[PDB]
């Protein structure tokens, strides 16, 4: 379909198909389909048009793909221009939740190139 | 080892139909001590092969053993200077026990869906001896017969 901007999976059940949107995982998607009155075991191909529309206003209640990314990136930019401790580690690129850096943190630091 | 020549174990027979040779086979298929998981695979693969083979379970199973059951294998023995490979005759208790190992490692490399489908495919095409499990047995007989000069 085109749920909340993108959503073209098929052959998947609707709880898993809905999780393609940036902003919904397994438990938010269950909250969508419960409020839409849709069974979770249906594919998107077997969805009528009278069901796809009542998901679009249902998914519109949660901040999703478009305006979520600019929300998250501004909050990082709120920290990085604040000069705080978490913003300072966001600048250099290093783990910000207070975990070790002597041997680990390959995720923040990328590969060990030299 | 050095000293002890220990006698072997006491395997209890298979619960579906009493056979220690099938009961030894489910141990080689087992992992992490999960025997009920492995028995689920064996019975579901033996019945879906017994339909394809026509023969009933055990005789459909044991005919697929002789196509992977070897008879000679190489060992690396040193007596004079540098060491080479001598082909030795495989003792019979090991002989089918080595065959069961080659099957379940061939079925684990199989790119099918489930282990029941994988093992039944491997155990069937070994009854027509076309699988990779017989190709292990053919390639141990090639390097044994390449080294037939040592006896």
């Amino acid at each position: 379909a085109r749920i909340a901007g993108i959503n073209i999976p098929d052959h998947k059940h609707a709880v898993i198909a809905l999780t393609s949107i940036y902003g919904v995982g397994k438990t938010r998607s269950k909250a969508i389909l419960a409020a839409a009155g849709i069974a979770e075991d249906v594919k998107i191909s077997e969805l009528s048009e009278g069901q796809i529309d009542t998901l679009r206003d249902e998914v519109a209640k949660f901040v999703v793909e478009g305006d979520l990314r600019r929300e998250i990136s501004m909050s990082i930019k709120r920290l990085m221009d604040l000069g705080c401790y978490r913003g300072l580690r966001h600048r250099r690129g290093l783990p910000v939740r207070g975990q070790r850096t002597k041997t680990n943190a390959r995720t923040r630091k990328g590969p060990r190139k030299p | 080892p050095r000293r002890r020549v220990i006698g072997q174990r006491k395997i209890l027979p298979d619960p579906k139909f009493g056979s220690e040779l099938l009961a030894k086979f489910v141990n080689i298929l087992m992992v992490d001590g999960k025997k009920s998981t492995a028995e689920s695979i064996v019975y579901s693969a033996l019945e879906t092969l017994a339909q394809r083979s026509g023969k009933s379970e055990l005789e459909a199973f044991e005919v697929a053993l002789e196509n992977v059951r070897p008879t000679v294998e190489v060992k690396s023995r040193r007596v004079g200077g540098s060491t080479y490979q001598v082909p030795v005759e495989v003792r019979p208790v090991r002989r089918n026990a080595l065959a069961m190992r080659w099957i379940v490692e061939a079925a684990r490399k199989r790119g099918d869906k489930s282990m029941a489908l994988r093992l039944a495919n491997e155990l069937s095409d070994a009854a027509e001896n076309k699988g990779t499990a017989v190709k292990k047995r053919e390639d141990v007989h090639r390097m044994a017969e390449a080294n037939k000069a040592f006896a």
């Binding site: 379909a1 929300e71 501004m74 | -």
Partner: protein, 66 residues
Amino acid sequence: MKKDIHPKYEEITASCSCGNVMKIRSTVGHDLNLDVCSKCHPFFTGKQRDVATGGRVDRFNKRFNI
């Protein structure tokens, strides 16, 4: 135009979810069924969402509560 070198440019019907059913000419093939359109897009409210950036000291007053 030249003949026989262009795609089949026929008249189709486009129906959005907001109710705007419109008649266009396109090479979709027939019966395009939309979700959003010009009078369905949130260009009048949805553009202003993160423009409302929110406060920080009111969050403190939502935690001090006194």
